[PDB]
Design a protein around this ligand. Structure first.
Ligand code: SQD
Ligand code: DGA
Ligand code: ZN
Ligand code: ZN
Lengths: 401, 61, 244, 117, 103, 87, 212, 44
């Protein structure tokens, strides 16, 4: 690259030979960059892999940071943790509904079809068509049956879609889905984060503040508050997901987890460590250095088999012990569950819906697909109430005329 | 009586397409970058009835 | 896109347009990454096999627009089976998997240790020392001195062996000259401005030469003097410690 | 040049080359039978779909092609078989209703053991 | 009144669409053994339009086989795309996005 | 039915695509591009439109929470080995 | 493929942590996990390399059985296109539908939550998993001589919403973290660029040398 | 079932000590060989 001329480069027997051969200078520059790349890689590997010898673990909890509360194995326990959010089993399908709604925004799987349809509905002037298909026409009315209903509803295909287009626009215009050509799977990561960081493109419409930045005052004092108070919970959920996945990636190997989380509803914190499961020590932790940190299956088998088999050396004849250990043995000493098992008591909350699914077999039709849920506010019962109410509305409208 | 969708479309379709449109969402709200009706219904201040009741209570006061 | 792998990359992240504000910036960047992953575009690689199964006829007709029998029919039916399996419920085949080269991982680009512990190791040493005391007069002192000595020697041997690779020395040299130029800048600024307020009150010639001829001996003598002075009280300290 | 494509090609070359070298060195120490080379031909013959038989005999009697008229001939039979497979997968085979597809993909019926003995 | 509930109009099943618009080659029928008998329990114990559309499809494919089609080829993306497909796609997108109001 | 395994097979496990594979599928389908009647076999629908019908409402693409089913479902786990040994 | 598919699962082991059914803060408590386990609601349990972390997979309540509930995808249909059902009336306890018997859906057709759970330090010596396994595997077909038949007893069949747990453990040696770090995509593109430039310079050396 | 086991050495620390040294030293050899390939076996 013609840099080794000047007078600052005399005195080296090799720079002069590169003064007369620019190919040599090109080779020199290439090598002088590659060697530095290699040095960076060496040092990065060392700094990544060396701290693994200095990690030691608590020997009571074995690096879990958490022990069990045994009473909760067989108005609750006041000693052991607090329940989590996805423990309320009655709110599962609602949370999943919200999440799949928010996810349908970003989802760019069907991108090409939406793109071709958007381009067709924008231009609407090219018309590079070809020979239309030989059309069979729907049955005339007055033929009652199932096949007739299928064909009749199928043929009314263009006016219904037209009404759909008239009510809701193309999804890219209502901002319902992500933009037109914001992301490209083969461009680069940097360009895609640039395009997505541009105008709140990472946020769905419901949480985009621009949608609301114009009206909020004395009336409720809430709309611009109850939106920044939802976007916050959203971002907390996302960061929690990142933390959980880093823990799983550490546990995929046998490494100790980086994020220590507080105990939960069945566990208490270890009292040797405070719950900090492991640490760094400047002492090299020989068990890792020689590869002896896993315990040889037969040993564990022996230890457990001897733990689950307590031995009685005394005999209840000499020592007048008539009952096994425990309290209140006397009261302990005083239907067809044996034929058809026990009844499961975690699924009563669905009983009602099940009964409906037996009184109305027509609900099992392959054409219908309700939202999903259990309460009178979800799925099946919503459709059923709607059907009965609209048939009653139409019944009352028949007689008035 | 006389819901909203029954006006913009009405006799242009039967009852089949009307129930078709009725079971897909209220009109066009928060998911579609618009403003909800229950969202807009909060931006308005107390109207003259409450203000006059307050003024009469102020006379009493 | 050039500093993708090094930690220096994180510095660029802060160049885009209850708790402090730095936490909010970090959370915004993590949300950006999560959102860019949630769009289901990271698995697409155009050199895939699932891709070359459907764009074979296109290339064939691009080129033609420009026992063997059983072999050919078997190859055709095999490609058709692969298509079917990628498409729907076909019940005896095994698909091939592809390298994923895109926003891979996503959960590693970010240091979130400071957020999860709400910032906005004594059991270890105790247990080590107590164990070597309990298991095996003045024998505990021999064992403890052996422990400390071997640990320090392990760390020193690791460092020296690392620095004995040539490319690592190139890395060190490059860093040294960069840091020297930055020190020159900062020192010049402070010197000039302090001169003002007390009145009130290129790189290639280095990067391409030997390094012991550019650096004077004065600095080696200074380093040696400081080191010597630091560690010269070790014999008396050691003696007075070990003698009760 | 896009090593993310070279690595699968490298492992594929290794696998296929090892297999070919193995079969070479295996039919030398053990020369192949001069007649059951027809038997393995029959074994692979019993596995071809039916959509190809209309072509197959045509190749014996000259009629078929020069070299490319054939290569475009196999594509038609291939796509016919392909669309037949799509139909069989989704809506069922040639002689079974929807219930038989349901009992096929629910694995309600065991493989017949009493008959085979 | 307008609450997301779905209805039998949106035929959300590929067997229906394929048996009404794409696949008409009929089957050699015989008595089965599994059937949805009484109590709705699965237990073990209009051919005019069909044939019409079938012959239509055979004629169209014979036509486009002889390259008699518009531009010149046997396999291309016939610009005029079926509208039922697009209607169903928009339907499903709309349902999953309008689930937002179900709280 | 008495001599059936309950450990299915490695072969009868059908593929199921996640969302990323669905996206890859639609992309690979879109960038995809005498004899006469009474000689065609009765499967003469237009090919590359049923393919798209099945890459949207099809069984292999209808489970939204499918991660990698064929691989992690063709290997056998501890309970399945216990059931196999017992037969 | 048979070989390569395996090899690739070890180098790229990070792309296989479950990113499908796990969305946000998906933790459950240890007591809730135990309560789900004891009632046979968990379909798959995946203990991890260090034996102190599990990913519990629980099917969506309507995808657990083969009820014909119209909130699921129509996988299995009658001739008249109605979803099939498999309920059986449980003679011992009628008047309560949640105690009836029903077959369970094949695992590949299920929707599943994928919760994350941290197991305590004494998870193995407490014997919870062992008790569950030993109970659920201790039932099967029997011979009744009073009727001279092969009977699958009722207390060995699945009621509504119950499934059969599959326990699976992972091997820490199947991770191959070093190569996963060495052949990362960024490093791959760097190697590609450097190889291209090196080939270019070598061929240019050849060109300027032979034309001399 | 024909249940079969291994050899199982009794030391545990003399058995694994030459293989652990290799586990620590080989990565540097791999890195150096890869970069050598690039910058010398091509850029001769
Ligand atoms: C018989 C006579 C003796 C013959 C010796 C034959 C070779 C013996 C040693 C070979 C394996 C070394 C070792 O086990 O791997 C440990 C290291 C990982 O380092 C390590 O990685 C480990 C983490 S992990 O295993 O990667 O997950 C980590 O624990 C460790 O600290 C770190 O150093 O693995 C490798 O270096 C080998 C990579 C595979 C070699 C093929 C190269 C492929 C070509 C490039 C493309
Ligand atoms: C035989 C001894 C084998 C004992 C090795 C046991 C495990 C080694 C853990 C080292 C971890 C250091 C590290 O964090 O790893 C990182 C570190 C990188 O710096 O790795 C390295 O560099 C490794 C350095 C090379 C080690 C080779 C030296 C061993 C033999 C010494 C010379 C033979 C001596 C002369 C023989 C005399 C005959 C009587
Ligand atoms: Zn502890
Ligand atoms: Zn407790």
């Amino acid at each position: 690259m013609g840099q080794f001329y000047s007078r600052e480069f005399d005195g080296d027997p090799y720079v002069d030979l590169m003064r007369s051969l620019p190919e040599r200078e090109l080779v020199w520059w290439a090598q002088k960059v590659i060697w530095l790349a290699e040095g960076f890689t060496f040092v990065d590997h060392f700094a990544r892999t060396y701290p693994r010898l200095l990690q030691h673990k608590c020997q009571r909890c074995k690096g879990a940071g958490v022990m069990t509360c045994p009473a909760c194995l067989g108005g609750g326990c006041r000693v052991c943790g607090t329940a989590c959010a996805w423990d309320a089993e009655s709110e599962w399908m609602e949370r999943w509904g919200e999440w799949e709604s928010r996810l349908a925004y970003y989802d760019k799987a069907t991108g090409p079809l939406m793109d071709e349809w958007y381009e067709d509905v924008l231009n609407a002037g090219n018309l590079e068509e070809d020979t239309p298909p030989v059309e069979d026409d729907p049955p005339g009315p007055e033929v009652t049956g199932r096949w007739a209903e299928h064909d009749r509803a199928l043929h009314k295909d263009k006016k219904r879609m037209a009404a759909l287009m008239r009510r809701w626009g193309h999804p890219y215009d209502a901002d319902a889905n992500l933009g037109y050509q914001i992301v490209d799977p083969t461009a680069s990561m940097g360009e895609n984060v640039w395009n997505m960081a541009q105008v709140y493109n990472s946020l769905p419409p419901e949480l985009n503040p621009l949608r609301t930045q114009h009206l909020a005052d004395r009336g409720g004092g809430n709309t611009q508050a109850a939106v920044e108070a939802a976007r916050s919970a959203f971002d907390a959920q996302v960061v929690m997901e990142a933390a959980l996945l880093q823990n799983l990636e550490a546990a995929a190997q046998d490494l100790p987890k980086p994020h220590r989380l507080p105990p939960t509803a069945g566990t208490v914190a270890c009292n040797e460590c405070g719950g900090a499961a492991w640490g760094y020590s400047f002492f090299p932790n020989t068990a890792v250095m020689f590869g002896l940190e896993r315990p040889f299956w037969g040993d564990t088998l022996a230890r457990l088999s001897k733990y689950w088999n307590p031995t009685q050396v005394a005999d209840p004849a000499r020592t007048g012990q008539l009952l096994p250990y425990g309290e209140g043995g006397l009261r302990r000493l005083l239907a067809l569950e044996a034929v058809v098992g026990k009844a499961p008591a975690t699924t009563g909350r669905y009983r009602r819906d099940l009964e409906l699914l037996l009184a109305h077999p027509e609900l099992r039709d392959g054409a219908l697909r309700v939202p999903g849920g259990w309460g009178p506010e979800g799925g099946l019962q919503t459709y059923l109430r709607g059907q009965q109410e609209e048939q009653a509305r139409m019944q009352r409208r028949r007689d008035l005329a | 009586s006389e819901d909203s969708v029954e006006q913009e479309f009405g006799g242009d379709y039967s009852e089949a397409s009307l129930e078709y449109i009725r079971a897909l969402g209220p009109k066009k709200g928060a998911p579609f970058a618009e403003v909800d009706p229950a969202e807009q219904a909060a931006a308005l201040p107390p109207s003259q009835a409450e203000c006059e009741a307050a003024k009469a209570v102020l006379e009493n006061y | 896109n050039n500093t993708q792998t090094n930690a220096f990359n994180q510095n660029l992240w802060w160049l885009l347009p209850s708790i402090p504000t730095a936490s909010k910036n970090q959370i915004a960047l993590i949300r950006l990454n999560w959102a860019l992953n949630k769009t289901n575009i990271n698995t697409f690689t155009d050199y895939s096999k699932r891709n070359n199964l459907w764009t074979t006829q296109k290339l064939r007709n691009q080129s033609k627009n420009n026992n063997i029998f059983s072999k050919k029919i078997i190859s055709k039916v095999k490609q058709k089976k692969q298509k079917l399996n990628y498409m729907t419920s076909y019940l005896n085949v095994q698909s091939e998997h592809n390298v994923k080269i895109f926003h891979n991982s996503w959960w590693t680009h970010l240091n979130i240790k400071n957020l999860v512990n709400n910032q906005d190791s004594e059991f270890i040493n105790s247990a080590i020392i107590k164990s070597i005391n309990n298991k095996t007069s003045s024998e505990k002192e021999t064992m403890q001195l052996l422990l400390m000595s071997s640990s320090i020697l392990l760390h020193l041997c690791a460092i020296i062996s690392l620095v004995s690779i040539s490319q690592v020395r190139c890395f060190v040299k490059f860093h040294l000259i960069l840091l020297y130029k930055l020190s020159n800048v900062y020192n010049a600024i402070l010197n000039q401005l302090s001169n003002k307020l007390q009145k009130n009150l290129g790189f290639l010639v280095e990067w391409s030469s030997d390094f012991i001829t550019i650096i004077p001996e004065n600095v080696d003598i200074y380093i040696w003097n400081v080191f010597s002075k630091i560690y010269r009280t070790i014999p008396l300290s050691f003696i007075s410690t070990t003698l009760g | 040049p896009r090593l993310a494509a070279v690595m699968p090609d490298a492992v594929y070359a290794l696998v296929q080359g090892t297999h070919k070298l193995g079969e070479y060195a295996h039919d030398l120490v053990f020369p192949p039978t001069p007649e059951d080379l027809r038997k393995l031909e029959q074994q692979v013959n019993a596995t071809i779909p039916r959509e190809f038989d209309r072509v197959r005999q045509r190749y014996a009697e000259g009629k078929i092609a020069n070299d490319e008229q054939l290569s475009s001939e196999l594509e038609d039979a291939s796509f016919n078989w392909y669309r037949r497979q799509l139909r069989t997968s989704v809506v069922g085979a040639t002689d079974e209703e929807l219930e038989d597809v349901a009992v096929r993909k629910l694995r309600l019926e065991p493989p017949a053991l009493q008959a085979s003995l | 009144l307008t609450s997301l509930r779905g209805s039998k109009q949106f035929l959300n099943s590929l067997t229906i669409l394929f048996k009404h618009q794409k696949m008409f080659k009929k089957k050699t029928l015989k008595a089965h053994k599994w059937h949805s008998d009484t109590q709705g329990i699965f237990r073990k114990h209009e051919e005019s339009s069909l044939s019409t559309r079938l012959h239509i499809q055979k004629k169209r494919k014979a036509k486009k086989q002889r390259l008699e089609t518009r531009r010149q080829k046997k396999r291309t993306r016939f610009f005029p795309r079926p509208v039922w497909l697009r209607s169903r796609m928009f339907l499903n997108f709309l349902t999953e996005r309008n689930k937002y109001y179900l709280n | 039915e008495l001599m059936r395994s309950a450990v299915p097979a490695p072969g009868e496990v059908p593929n199921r695509n996640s969302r990323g594979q669905v996206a890859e599928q639609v992309r690979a389908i879109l960038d995809q591009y005498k004899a006469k009647t009474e000689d065609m076999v009765d499967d003469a629908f237009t090919t590359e439109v049923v393919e798209e019908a099945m890459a949207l409402f099809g069984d292999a693409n209808s489970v939204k929470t499918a991660w990698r089913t064929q691989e992690v479902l063709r290997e056998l786990s501890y309970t399945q080995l216990w059931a196999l040994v017992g037969e | 493929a048979i070989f390569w598919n395996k090899l690739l699962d070890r180098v790229q082991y990070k792309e296989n942590l479950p990113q499908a059914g796990l969305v946000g803060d998906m933790r459950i408590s240890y007591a809730k996990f135990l309560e789900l386990l004891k009632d046979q609601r968990v379909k798959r349990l995946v203990v991890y390399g260090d034996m102190r972390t599990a990913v519990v997979e629980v099917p969506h309540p309507w995808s657990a059985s083969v009820l014909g509930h119209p909130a699921t995808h129509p996988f299995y249909e009658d001739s008249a296109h109605n979803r099939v059902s498999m309920l059986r009336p449980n003679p011992a306890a009628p008047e309560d539908v949640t105690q009836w018997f029903c077959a369970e859906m094949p695992e590949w057709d299920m929707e599943k939550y994928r919760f994350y759970v941290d197991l305590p330090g004494d998870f193995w010596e407490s014997g919870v998993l062992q008790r569950h396994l030993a109970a659920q595997r201790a039932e099967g077909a029997v011979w009744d001589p009073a009727s001279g038949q092969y009977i699958l007893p009722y207390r060995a069949q699945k009621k509504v919403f119950q499934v059969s747990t599959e326990v699976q453990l992972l091997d820490p040696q199947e991770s191959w973290d070093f190569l996963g770090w060495l052949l990362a995509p960024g490093r791959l593109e760097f190697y590609e660029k450097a190889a291209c430039v090196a080939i270019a310079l070598r061929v240019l050396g050849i060109v300027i040398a032979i034309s001399t | 079932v024909v249940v079969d086991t291994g050899v199982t050495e009794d030391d545990r620390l003399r058995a694994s000590l030459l293989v652990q040294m290799l586990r620590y030293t080989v990565p540097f050899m791999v890195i150096s060989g890869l970069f050598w390939m690039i910058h010398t076996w091509i850029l001769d």
